[PDB]
Amino acid sequence: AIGPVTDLTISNADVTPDGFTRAAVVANGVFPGPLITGNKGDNFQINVIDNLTNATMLKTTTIHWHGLFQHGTNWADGPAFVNQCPIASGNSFLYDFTVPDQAGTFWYHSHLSTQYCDGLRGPLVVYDPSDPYASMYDVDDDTTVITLSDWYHTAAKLGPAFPPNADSVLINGLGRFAGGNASDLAVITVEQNKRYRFRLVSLSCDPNFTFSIDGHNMTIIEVDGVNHEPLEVDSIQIFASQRYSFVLNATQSVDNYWIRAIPNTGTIDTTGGLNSAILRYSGADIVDPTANATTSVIPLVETDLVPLDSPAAPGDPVVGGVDLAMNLDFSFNGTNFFINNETLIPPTVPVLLQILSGAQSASDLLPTGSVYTLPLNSTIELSFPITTVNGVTNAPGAPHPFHLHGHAFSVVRSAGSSDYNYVNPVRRDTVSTGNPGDNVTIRFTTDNAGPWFLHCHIDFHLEAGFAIVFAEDTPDTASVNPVPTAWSDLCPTYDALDPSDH
Ligand SMILES: *[C@@H]1O[C@H](CO)[C@@H](O[C@@H]2O[C@H](CO)[C@@H](O)[C@H](O)[C@H]2NC(C)=O)[C@H](O)[C@H]1NC(C)=O
Ligand SMILES: *[C@@H]1O[C@H](CO)[C@@H](O[C@@H]2O[C@H](CO)[C@@H](O)[C@H](O)[C@H]2NC(C)=O)[C@H](O)[C@H]1NC(C)=O
Ligand SMILES: *[C@@H]1O[C@H](CO)[C@@H](O)[C@H](O)[C@H]1NC(C)=O
Ligand SMILES: [Cu+2]
Ligand SMILES: [Cu+2]
Ligand SMILES: [Cu+2]
Ligand SMILES: [Cu+2]
Secondary structure (H helix, E strand, C coil), rough: CCCEEEEEEEEEEEEECCCCEEEEEECCCCCCCEEEEEEECEEEEEEEEEECHHHHHCCCCCCECCCCCCCCCCCCCECCCCCCCCCCCEEEEEEEECCCCCCCEEEECCCCCCHHHCCCEEEEEEEECCCCCCCCCCCHHHHHHHEEEEECCCCCCCCCCCCCCCCECCCCCEEECCCCCCCEEEEEEECCCCCCEEEEEEEECCCCEEECCCCCCCEEEEEEEEEEEEEEEEEEECCCCCEEEEECCCCCCEEEEEEEEEECCCCCCCCCCEEEEEEECCCCCCCCCCCCCCCCCCCHHHHCEEECCCCCCCCCCCCCCCCCCEEEEEEEEECCCCEEEEEECCCCHHHHHHHHCCCCCHHHCCCCCEEECCEEECEEECCCCCCCCCCCCCCCCCCCCCCCCCCEEEEECCCCCCCCCCCCCEECCCCCCCCCCCEEEEECCCCCCEEEEECCCCHHHHHHCEEEEEEEEECCCCHHCCCCCCHHHHHHHHCCHHHHHC
């Protein structure tokens, strides 16, 4: 598609992906936003131009590049009031970062409040010119990126704080709803005998999908950017913001098959052509698939995923055997979520800026009680217990997929299991915290200077303040992250704007 140097033009326009036309916030006119492409070691320069006129979906914007470590470029990370002030309408801003150590599938989405649910979301792929799996597949390009997105007929700010379900599930940006127009479905074409590398992206706001293909199989090689040992899989449970790359061996008779993406919540049912896309072998008739969905006997299990390189998790194999152990006490008061008796209500001055202003200790950072300081070259173990309590159950709205910015973590203990794995646990940038009784525990090493966000990636929870910030190596933040003029120009230019022009 575009990149590695290009412009993202962000504008308000009416779009109709499910048969229903509604105004949205979109990148380069099309939803989901255009595929940004680059190679390992390429220097990305993305000139985000803000041309927004609809106040109700926010005229100001900021884009995060999910899964990209952003070393030396913490300013360019995205999160509003953590890493930068939002870009004003009528202005433009350049995101100038190199990606030297990273190879695989990512995505980019607006990180200002709930804007990305209103449309500002697109896939982002970095390709590896020496990809250890290039002798597995024949095709990998634009028409192999499969984008799963939940879609809403009512706008983010206009509907409830916590939407119960999506109106439609969009595959490659095309799906249907209940009393649906029965309009266009997504069409993925394949040639006989040819291997396909499919890059599966979850641009979801809330629901998690059970992704499956009729009469076929998926061989996962990649989870959330990180290269993993090949896995035999029937169906993939992909939580919000997660990514998977699977190689599909096109070995079945020339026919139309269903590409299925059942969400966990909402209208679960293939009848109507809802939650579906078309897998069409080249030469079969331009009709709807008549294929049926079988039961899953070899489904995706997290604990089964093993990293391709450097599989051992940091820290010695012990519960607590780590430099800094931290446990997150969750709770919910009706409107807002809480981590350690605190909620993230975003400060006037970005967490980053605060450090460049000379702030150092956790006591001096804002918001207070929510910014934790982490020393460098120390190993960190986090744990997300979803508990049933005395009869209360903290953190409803489960399961919650927690994402850590600027790091790829080893998931030593996964949802649904109580065993700990330190020898070769899966390595990813967002993990499901699961259901009550799951003490999901993750480990990662502090190899990145600057402030980083840790939040549930269900965007409606994010807005409820289910988040904390890691001020990782505060003394070196200033120096290790050189800030361009455009970035420092943002906060004085943004605070001048009226709530009307927000
Ligand atoms: C700005 O965007 C909003 C939300 O995207 C639009 O709100 C629509 O308003 C009409 C009448 O109030 C409703 O029937 C629709 O439900 C709203 N859309 C959504 C998605 O909720 C609004 O029309 C926009 N203003 C313009 C004209 O650009
Ligand atoms: C979830 O797991 C963590 C450890 O991985 C538990 O936290 C530790 O629990 C022990 C008691 O077993 C305490 O002495 C430690 O001080 C705890 N670590 C802290 C304070 O970060 C945690 O209790 C588990 N959650 C539950 C209740 O299952
Ligand atoms: C819930 O917490 C939020 C933020 O802390 C607050 O605005 C609201 O007043 C709280 N509701 C209750 C139970 O008082
Ligand atoms: Cu994300
Ligand atoms: Cu991210
Ligand atoms: Cu959540
Ligand atoms: Cu984030």
